[PDB]
Design a protein around this ligand. Structure first.
Ligand SMILES: [K+]
Ligand SMILES: [K+]
Ligand SMILES: [K+]
Ligand SMILES: [K+]
Ligand SMILES: [K+]
Ligand SMILES: [K+]
Ligand SMILES: [Mg+2]
Ligand SMILES: [Mg+2]
Ligand SMILES: [Mg+2]
Ligand SMILES: [Mg+2]
Ligand SMILES: [Mg+2]
Ligand SMILES: [Mg+2]
Ligand SMILES: [Mg+2]
Ligand SMILES: [Mg+2]
Ligand SMILES: [Mg+2]
Lengths: 240, 128, 225, 63, 109, 125, 53
RNA sequence: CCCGUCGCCGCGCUCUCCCCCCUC
RNA sequence: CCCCGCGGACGCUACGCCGCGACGAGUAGGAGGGCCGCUGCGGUGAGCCUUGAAGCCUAGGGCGCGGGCCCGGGUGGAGC
């Protein structure tokens, strides 16, 4: 086995390489790389044990079903596309770059102005409105429900902790194990608790973003106010 | 809880309202049962706008979901336990229902047997 | 014999694979040759007229031999002679286009149905986009979309036409087998012209949409498919 | 709207015997398969004659 | 702490003079009086918020009398800033001349 | 002959049920209980039927022997299988496939045996 | 099949075979033909009818 | 034999060996 | 020369099932289909029914393009 090489056919447009068939034949040296010519044990034997009980038993793994439904569903045709969500490409608007001030449009933080840190692996944006400034923690948000303003701060050379991933921010639940019939309420735990790890991470990011916010004048006051529509102005006439 | 059908496609109904007979609203003697208007000057037959619509084959339901109950099953009328076992191998596509004339004592046995054979009954609690 | 039959099946599959591979290479090179031919005629007309002007003379181009005819009126109240000619042009529906080879016999037919059609001289791009986007073949009396080259080759291979490029070449440069290639094409079912029509009831030269518009049929085609 | 006539769309021809003779229906099944699964035009002619009415199947004298 | 939605008016259904297509509605957005300014609002979620008699469940809140029929702006209508909207259910005719909110949610800016 | 007898009873039979746009057949040895030439339990030289046991446990696999086709008293051989579900299905599979006794009814008989056994196990609360 | 005529046992009044056999009469190999049977039955049931007016 | 990631079409790498630039 | 697996969905009321393409105005009139409907007769449903038939009523649940039909509740009292 040889070491895998790079593509050697740079893509100039999606689906088209820069070099032709003959050009790639020579780049690959296909003239000298010409070739002419040259499992899973379903059953396992095991010592059963016992006098005159036979030597062993040919035990087959994955036994046959012991019940069949009255009818089944035919299998699907093949689709040659339709990748799972974890393999989708993640697209981010050109107006959203790290350090950009965003405006939240939905949720309990409606209309607040927050700072954009990174896009996460699922395409969700990681935002912090410095929790001291507007009570928005390190939180995920969707780029389709934010407004990217033109005001930006340089958050380069700041360290967003590595464990701040989608699995970190994914919600957790209790109900309803060991309990089927609902007569005693399982409404306990509903008070979601801020993990001490979350407080540590919030303190770490803010300690190095807040100083850069304080650098230029009255940005903390800007982050501290909320966005609203006044009867004079209209969103299509506004420059963000 | 209830027995589920093999597949539950989305049932699309082209029309959800009945085709009422022309002028059945103006007369008691004329019932809502559809009758094709054949008068020489009838504006419903001529299909003038804003009039009572006429049934035609274009309103036909999809053959995949025709005669399908809202529960995704199709119904087979049964009169005794013996007719119930024809649905043993059609459990997940066809549901039984008991005829109106069946006695209270006898439909108890039908419901009991259908629970055993995993056949769904549309009227399991019907005389009690 | 299991090994012998397995080898026999591999030999046949390889031979079939080499046959497509040779057929694909032929299709590739013929399209390359057509591209060379297409610019040769385009440059020749420029050069021909360019040298007449040097001499102070006039180069009169050959009269176009290909026309795209679009029916622009409906099927209500049509006189029998106009009705018959539209059927002979395979224009039984409004906004049905078809390719017509131009000669004395066909032109006089186009003059009969003058108020009912808009026609002109399609260029190379119009032929390509009509065939590729809306090209349907009449295969066993069925309207079949030209999704594979095998559909063209099965019905027209005896005439040398085996791919979409060959079909486009025969239609554009009216070849020997134009009648077979043109009739193989189902009449084109075009959408309503996006952006409207100036006036369907009068001739093009009087502000309307009917009659012969020489090269302006290409503007109509873009808005129409 | 399209400009065609619909009075000749439905071709009038026997697609099966109007008889209920179960023995005739059995050998119609046999020759329906033979006509489909062979290239013999003889089977096609025999199959369509099996659909035909009695007046279209006149008796053949020995002479 | 703010309006956060644009004020719009349900002017009527898409229609000819003598035929009315109730599945789509024509909305007049405040401040948008030309067709070239409707680009911002295309695809934006629109809501017809009203009140009824019986309480209904409120997402993230106690049940109240507020109901809503959701929709979105589909395209521009005419040359003067009207937009066409599709709602999950055809808008009731009692809402003509009343408030429709345009959410700004699916932001492209 | 099966094909000739089918042409007689395809639409005229005492076992025929035609209701609710559906058709069913109630002859003793009809797997799936449908009106069809393949599944008819009377017209074929060899047939297989699966029925619940006389008591409330096990299945009865009845096959049709080849000798006395005009002698209905001794024309069917009935065997009773009263073991676990997986072993019961294997026996029915071997009876049909290994004997090459109507292999086109293999899954129908296996599915019917599963339905019978599934109906015999007690219901839950 | 059609030319083959089996032997049928004659059963005794006690219900078991008596040892006597009769070859199957050829009438039992005649064509089975319900459309004729239905036709003949349809027109012969009309023959015992009693007039009404 | 755990659910055909399959056909046509367009490509990439390996069964050749060297280097170059980042990264462990 | 299948065998560490002895195994491998559905189907084909052939009057059935499946695929592809085009098409769909209609008086007078013609034809086809009707698991539309009424009454009675021959068969058949080891059919239903005083533990409630027919009929009738119903802001009850549904099915069918439709003719119509099934089921729940009430009334009724001997058949269907
Ligand atoms: K009609
Ligand atoms: K004729
Ligand atoms: K309010
Ligand atoms: K009867
Ligand atoms: K109906
Ligand atoms: K009653
Ligand atoms: Mg309906
Ligand atoms: Mg009335
Ligand atoms: Mg009149
Ligand atoms: Mg006119
Ligand atoms: Mg436009
Ligand atoms: Mg005129
Ligand atoms: Mg039409
Ligand atoms: Mg007509
Ligand atoms: Mg018609």
């Amino acid at each position: 086995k040889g070491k895998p090489h790079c593509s050697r056919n740079p893509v100039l447009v999606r689906g088209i390489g820069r070099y032709s068939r003959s050009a790639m034949y020579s780049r690959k040296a296909m003239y000298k790389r010409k070739y002419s010519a040259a499992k899973v044990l379903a059953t396992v034997t095991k010592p059963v044990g016992g006098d005159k009980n036979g030597g062993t038993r040919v035990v087959k793994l994955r036994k046959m079903p012991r019940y069949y439904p009255t009818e089944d569903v035919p299998r699907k045709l093949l689709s040659h596309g339709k990748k799972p969500f974890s393999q989708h490409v993640r697209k981010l608007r050109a107006s959203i770059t790290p350090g950009t001030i965003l405006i939240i449009l939905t949720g309990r933080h409606r209309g607040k102005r927050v700072v954009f840190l990174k896009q996460l692996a699922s395409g969700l944006l990681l935002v912090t409105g410095p929790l001291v400034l507007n009570r928005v923690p390190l939180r995920r948000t969707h780029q389709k429900f934010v407004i990217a303003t033109s005001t930006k701060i340089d958050i380069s050379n700041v360290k967003i902790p590595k464990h701040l991933t989608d699995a970190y921010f994914k919600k957790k639940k209790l109900r309803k194990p060991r309990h089927q019939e609902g007569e005693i309420f399982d409404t306990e735990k509903e008070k979601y608790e801020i993990t001490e790890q979350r407080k540590i991470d919030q303190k770490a990011v803010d300690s190095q973003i807040l100083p850069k916010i304080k650098a230029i004048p009255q940005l903390q006051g800007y982050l501290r106010s909320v966005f609203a529509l006044t009867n004079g102005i209209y969103p299509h006439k506004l420059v963000f | 809880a209830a027995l589920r059908p093999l597949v539950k496609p989305k049932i699309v109904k082209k029309r959800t309202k009945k085709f009422i007979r022309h002028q059945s609203d103006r007369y008691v003697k004329i019932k809502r049962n559809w009758r094709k208007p054949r008068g020489i000057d009838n504006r419903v037959r001529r299909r003038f706008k804003g009039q009572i619509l006429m049934p035609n084959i274009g309103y036909g339901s999809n053959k995949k979901t025709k005669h399908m109950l809202p529960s995704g099953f199709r119904k087979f009328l049964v009169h005794n336990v013996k007719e119930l076992e024809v649905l043993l191998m059609c459990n997940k596509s066809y549901c039984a229902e008991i005829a109106h004339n069946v006695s209270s004592k006898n439909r108890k046995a039908i419901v009991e047997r259908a629970a055993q054979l995993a056949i769904r009954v549309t009227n399991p609690n019907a005389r009690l | 014999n299991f090994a012998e039959l397995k080898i026999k099946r591999l030999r046949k599959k390889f031979a079939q694979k080499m046959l497509r591979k040779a057929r694909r290479k032929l299709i590739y090179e013929k399209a390359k040759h057509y591209h060379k031919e297409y610019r040769q005629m385009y440059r020749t007309e420029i050069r021909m007229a360019r040298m007449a002007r040097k001499a102070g003379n006039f180069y009169v181009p050959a009269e176009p031999k290909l026309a795209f005819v679009i029916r622009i009126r409906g099927i209500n109240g049509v006189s029998p002679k106009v009705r018959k000619v539209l059927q002979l042009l395979r224009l039984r529906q409004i906004f049905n286009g078809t390719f017509v080879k131009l000669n004395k016999a066909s032109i006089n037919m186009l003059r009969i149905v003058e108020p009912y059609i808009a026609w002109g001289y399609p260029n190379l791009k119009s032929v390509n986009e009509l065939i590729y986007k809306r090209g349907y073949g009449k295969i066993n009396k069925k309207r079949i979309a030209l999704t594979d080259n095998a559909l063209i080759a099965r019905s027209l291979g005896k005439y040398g036409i085996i791919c979409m490029e060959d079909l486009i070449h025969e239609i554009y440069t009216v070849g020997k087998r134009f009648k077979e290639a043109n009739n193989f094409l189902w009449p084109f079912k075009l959408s309503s012209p996006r952006g409207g029509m100036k006036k369907k009831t009068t001739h093009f030269v009087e502000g309307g949409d009917a009659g012969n518009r020489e090269d302006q049929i290409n503007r109509l085609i873009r808005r129409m498919n | 709207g399209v400009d065609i006539r619909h009075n000749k769309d439905r071709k009038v021809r026997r697609k099966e015997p109007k008889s209920q003779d179960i023995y005739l229906r059995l050998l119609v099944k046999l020759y329906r398969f033979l006509a489909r699964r062979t290239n013999s035009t003889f089977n096609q002619v025999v199959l369509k004659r099996l659909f035909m009415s009695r007046t279209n199947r006149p008796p053949l004298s020995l002479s | 702490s703010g309006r956060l939605w644009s004020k719009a008016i349900f002017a009527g259904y898409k229609r000819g003079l003598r035929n009315q297509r109730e599945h789509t509605a024509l909305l007049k957005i405040e401040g948008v009086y030309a067709r070239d300014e409707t680009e911002f609002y295309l695809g934006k979620r629109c809501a017809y918020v009203y009140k009824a008699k019986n309480n209904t469940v409120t997402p993230g809140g106690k049940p109240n009398k507020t109901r809503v029929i959701w929709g979105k702006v589909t395209r521009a209508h005419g040359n003067s800033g009207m937009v066409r909207a599709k709602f999950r259910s055809n808008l009731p005719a009692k809402a003509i001349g009343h408030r429709i909110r345009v959410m700004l949610y699916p932001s492209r800016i | 002959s099966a094909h000739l007898q089918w042409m007689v009873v395809r639409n005229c039979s005492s076992f025929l049920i035609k209701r609710n746009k559906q058709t069913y057949s109630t002859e003793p040895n009809n797997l799936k209980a449908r009106n069809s030439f393949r599944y008819n339990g009377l017209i074929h030289r060899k047939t297989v039927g699966v029925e619940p046991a006389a008591d409330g446990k096990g299945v009865v696999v009845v096959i049709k022997r080849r000798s006395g086709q005009r002698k209905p008293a001794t024309s069917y051989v009935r065997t009773t299988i009263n073991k676990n579900a997986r072993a019961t299905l294997s026996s029915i599979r071997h009876m049909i496939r290994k004997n090459k006794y109507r292999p086109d009814l293999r899954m129908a008989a296996i599915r019917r045996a599963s339905a019978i056994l599934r109906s015999q196990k007690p219901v839950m609360v | 099949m059609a030319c083959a005529r089996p032997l049928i046992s004659v059963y005794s009044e006690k219900g078991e075979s008596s040892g006597k056999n009769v070859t199957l009469p050829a009438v039992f190999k005649a064509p089975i033909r319900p459309d004729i049977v239905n036709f003949v039955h349809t027109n012969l049931r009309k023959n015992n009818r009693q007039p009404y007016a």
